[PDB]
Ligand binder design. Sequence first.
Ligand SMILES: [Mg+2]
Ligand SMILES: [Mg+2]
Ligand SMILES: [Mg+2]
Ligand SMILES: [Mg+2]
Ligand SMILES: [Mg+2]
Ligand SMILES: [Mg+2]
Ligand SMILES: [Mg+2]
Ligand SMILES: [Mg+2]
Ligand SMILES: [Mg+2]
Ligand SMILES: [Mg+2]
Ligand SMILES: [Mg+2]
Ligand SMILES: [Mg+2]
Lengths: 356, 356, 356, 356
Amino acid sequence: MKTTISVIKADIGSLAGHHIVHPDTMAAANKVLASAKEQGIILDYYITHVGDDLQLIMTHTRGELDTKVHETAWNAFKEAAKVAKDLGLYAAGQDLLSDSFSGNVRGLGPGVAEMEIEERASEPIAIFMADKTEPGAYNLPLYKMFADPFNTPGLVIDPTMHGGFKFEVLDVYQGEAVMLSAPQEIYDLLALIGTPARYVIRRVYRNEDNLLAAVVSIERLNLIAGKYVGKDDPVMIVRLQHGLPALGEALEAFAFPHLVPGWMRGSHYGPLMPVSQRDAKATRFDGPPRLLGLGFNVKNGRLVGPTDLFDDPAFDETRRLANIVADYMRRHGPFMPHRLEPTEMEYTTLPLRFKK
Amino acid sequence: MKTTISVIKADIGSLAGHHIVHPDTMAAANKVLASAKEQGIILDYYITHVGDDLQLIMTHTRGELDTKVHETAWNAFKEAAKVAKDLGLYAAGQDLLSDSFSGNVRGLGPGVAEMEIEERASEPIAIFMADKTEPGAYNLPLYKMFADPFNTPGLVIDPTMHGGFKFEVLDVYQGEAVMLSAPQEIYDLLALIGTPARYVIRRVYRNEDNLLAAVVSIERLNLIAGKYVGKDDPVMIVRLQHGLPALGEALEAFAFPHLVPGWMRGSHYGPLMPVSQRDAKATRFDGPPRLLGLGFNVKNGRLVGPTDLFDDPAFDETRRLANIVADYMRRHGPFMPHRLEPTEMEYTTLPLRFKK
Amino acid sequence: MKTTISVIKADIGSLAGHHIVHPDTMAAANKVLASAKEQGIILDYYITHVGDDLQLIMTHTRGELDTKVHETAWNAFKEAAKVAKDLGLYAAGQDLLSDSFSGNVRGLGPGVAEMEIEERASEPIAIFMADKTEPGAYNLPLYKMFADPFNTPGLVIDPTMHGGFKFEVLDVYQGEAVMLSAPQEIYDLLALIGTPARYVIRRVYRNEDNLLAAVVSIERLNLIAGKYVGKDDPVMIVRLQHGLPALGEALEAFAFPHLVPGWMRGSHYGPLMPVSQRDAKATRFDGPPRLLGLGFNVKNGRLVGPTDLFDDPAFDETRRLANIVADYMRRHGPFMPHRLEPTEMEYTTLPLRFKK
Amino acid sequence: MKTTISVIKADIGSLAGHHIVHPDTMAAANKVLASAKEQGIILDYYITHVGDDLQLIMTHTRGELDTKVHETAWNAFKEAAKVAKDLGLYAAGQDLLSDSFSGNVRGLGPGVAEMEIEERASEPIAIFMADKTEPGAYNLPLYKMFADPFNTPGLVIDPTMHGGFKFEVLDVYQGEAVMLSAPQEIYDLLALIGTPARYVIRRVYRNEDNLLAAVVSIERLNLIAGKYVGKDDPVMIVRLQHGLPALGEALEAFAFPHLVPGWMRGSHYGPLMPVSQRDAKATRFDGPPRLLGLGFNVKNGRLVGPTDLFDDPAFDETRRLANIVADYMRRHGPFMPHRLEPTEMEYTTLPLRFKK
Ligand SMILES: [Mg+2]
Ligand SMILES: [Mg+2]
Ligand SMILES: [Mg+2]
Ligand SMILES: [Mg+2]
Ligand SMILES: [Mg+2]
Ligand SMILES: [Mg+2]
Ligand SMILES: [Mg+2]
Ligand SMILES: [Mg+2]
Ligand SMILES: [Mg+2]
Ligand SMILES: [Mg+2]
Ligand SMILES: [Mg+2]
Ligand SMILES: [Mg+2]
């Protein structure tokens, strides 16, 4: 008997630009999930947003890629999008690329990260949700959490973690994945994941017992649509403690606001800014990219929490540095490396008299 | 069938100096607009303030310079001023220069920015309202939003924007306007708008289709009254997205807190400080100048929102820099260039034994 | 009768790594140029280095791409490389890719920027030489100097400059060039030069009279060798004053230390640090990239000067920001966008178990 | 036929406290080494100091632990100490613990780092010499240089380095050493070297070919004398380039001024401050600890150089941070963790009424 934690998210429109989810659209999604919970389809849920991305966090006993859970999410998004359209919100139904649902949401526009697990003696988790970036934004943090002993001293001091972790790395262009184990294969790992537009960490497992420790949403709108229609805006679930990274080691991996692709027009690098729920909205230059972190405990399918992780003074300098770096990046205007590299600009309209 | 967005504002008195609009005066204005909405004169409205300037944001179907909409605003201001006088507020009825109303508010004291438009597939807008400065304070930001590719990379990457924008520049001293198109005429444009006391951007249009993209209030109290009676305190409406600047590009143009004329006694340059609604009040040296930004979507004449745009951590360094610059400017005392140039001081009382 | 200014440079080996040119190698080059000057091949010269790149600045009356001037430079490099080898310097003869010389140095390894001009009533110039980067590093500065009215207010105020400048942009991958004129074609210009690895500004001309105003070295070692053998380390000559940018406008364009490609192992972005002659050496992470600027007047083929342009307190904050940004970039380790994009890594050894 | 690089150092007394080597004592050492060079005992040498430690850098063909080379160093120290005593310098002959020499300097007081090598196609090296700390101060930097891919991206991108490096770790308390290979054994490595007073990296080798890449002096005065008589003040030689860390990767490892044990009275942690030769002297609180870095090329036993590595603006923020951290540490007074842990204080006089 297992519990599945599913985070399914989508942009269904937003106020004043790609800025923030309107509360009336969340209330519409809530009605759908409330009904699903009453019917016993799901055991519990929490709805929120980061920027213009509406987040459905659900626990249930129906496994990964469950048609009914995914269809419940789809319906919640559709009801939210209808309210968005009635309110004349910008980009109403943005990420709902298909007219209809079948099978599951993957390839329809919504992003999904989910894990079916056996709840541990206690089951603390952190869920990270980002706006204005793509799934590869989690590569550097996951490398740090699970492989870098300067981030996660448990790797050095905690006998249960000494055996290390392995990474399922997806080549999103070719649709093939490889497993690489730390610390033995870290140089090979970094040779790949250092290119986050192509090679994305999708899951992480503990080596000793193959315990599933983290999952990342790997939907990429560029690759689904064949052109730029928005930033993917990814989510990740990380299990904590008991020989997995401590909450503090997971958070340590976000204390440095690294440059991630996306931001204005899906065409720029900007610093990932960890923020409180109230600050999870896109402003200057349609960002900077925003990261919301929520901590929960899962108990018999119940979601206890959330606690808003980055809403705390220990991240005030991280936010200040993100602001300073955003200004520095912006002084580059439309030049690389503030503007994206050509292989990723090729999905924008940029492509649209030379003499020998 | 078109929707008109009208922002009409006026100083009708304030608490403790030129500091803040008193809530009882807003409640008085509200009664008038509530009645107008009930009667179907206007479709929706939002009332707020920036500093000592009371803001009436109205949507309706009666066009630009409509006598009845303007008279509704005038009456709301008069009721607010009566409450101000009953409360013994400072400068009760300040900007109500005429004893009576006729035609429209222009030349009577209140400022107005309005645009009659066809609502787009969605109609996101930003409305900017400033205290302690004059309309030319928007020249540099509008130049950046609509012409500078280091601000608005859509000009470079977005095929719909590549054709550029044109600017209606008003010579406010001579009462004549010229149209200049970017990027071809940017050097000529800057030769004018670099003198913001004289040449003010009044409207901006997209070149390809002549779509009206922005409007600025161009009432100038100095020029209406023939002497200094206050700072004009201007407003601007900017349409967003769909081949116009993104919300983030409009906000990028205010990320640098530039020096603007006004501040204490209408006689100084100080940095434009973008602020939240709660911080939209004038304090040190009767400023620094304050900028409030509200995002809305317009839907069949309904105002959805507002979202308070600058109330966000991405502008915390902008505010800090404004504070540092304010202190630096203030160490100049009554010397140029902190004090205004003679041609603009001539409207103050400054003019009021030399030997060959 | 014209004067040609030729800057020909090459890495012929360095002390302790890719750090600094050894003085004995400069003395060897000097002997060759001293002889050439005595023979009347060249009229004057100045020898220096930036980092590990030995710089030959020569004036003569023999035109661009002169075989004898280029062969003189080649011989000076060969004598310098022989001393480097005798001293056991690192990478002795690094940029001397050919065993022998023919025609000119282009394609043999050395970089060259040269302009044949008619000396003006006075002929002030600035010569910029960079280590640990590539020619496209000058794209943003040249755009600013010659097209951006926020950099070069002469474009707005100086009637002789109002007509603007045009840019010869080389597609270095395809070996074709296009001319684009500012301000009319700036959005098209930026769409190209924003990708500096591919599209490089090679020359700039004044529109009114087609006066040649600047030239950049466009040798790219990657493209010459078919693999990474070093950073190109480019040079540029800019003519000043008399309706061309003032010295101060040229220097303004380097006051922002932008991110440029190169740095460690030719595989990273780092900030361009303008430095004095004494600080023109590569240290932390084999950089940051260094920029030396020398001002001269040219008088009947005589080089009057140099003055060391960035050795001045007005660039102390530029250097401090470069240091702060270098640290921030370095915390990214081997991840983009600190590490280069894949299309440019493909020249490194990086290219050297996936399941569906 | 091999070349040996030997760095042998000792404190023979200093001016005004433990502050700086007096030049007359260096001139005395010079006479001895000049004679040794004339006799052909050594091929070349360079004499300098860091703080109160007199440094003899010698190249020769006599191998590691050569009695005659060590006796030459001993004699140079004795002549320098005689001058120190004649000048009434503080702590004249400090590190000369034995009255007489036999075999080699190890265990007599002087520190030694030496490597017998086959000179590579070119042989660039960096020599690091520190005052006011102990050999374990190099553990974190050597880990970074040779194992951390966020420091040395060659580990990821350079096929010649992908196989990694191994570390000879000396347990200085038990006098036994272990070899640990990166990246496979990094967690075990860090579990040891994270305690730098006990486990010290002594040598580093490349895994592929067992090439000797670095050596550290492991003399520890506490353990030689059985009590505190000074800080060991260690030296290290690092070979560079050609599939070993680049100069810039070696320097990157010192860009963070980490806390190291020693400083005042051998009893405190303070930040390691990389400095120029002119700044290599101990001041505030008898520090902070100082690090001098000299780059050379070795050519047929000749020392070409030095270049003063940290005398460069790229380390100005490193020095500023060291100053800020020194002040912060100092506000702790005699409390851990500014004061050393008890197991290391036990060598001081600290050890020299409790009721149940
Ligand atoms: Mg959106
Ligand atoms: Mg989003
Ligand atoms: Mg998105
Ligand atoms: Mg007032
Ligand atoms: Mg006001
Ligand atoms: Mg006013
Ligand atoms: Mg080199
Ligand atoms: Mg170079
Ligand atoms: Mg080079
Ligand atoms: Mg001493
Ligand atoms: Mg010492
Ligand atoms: Mg000592």
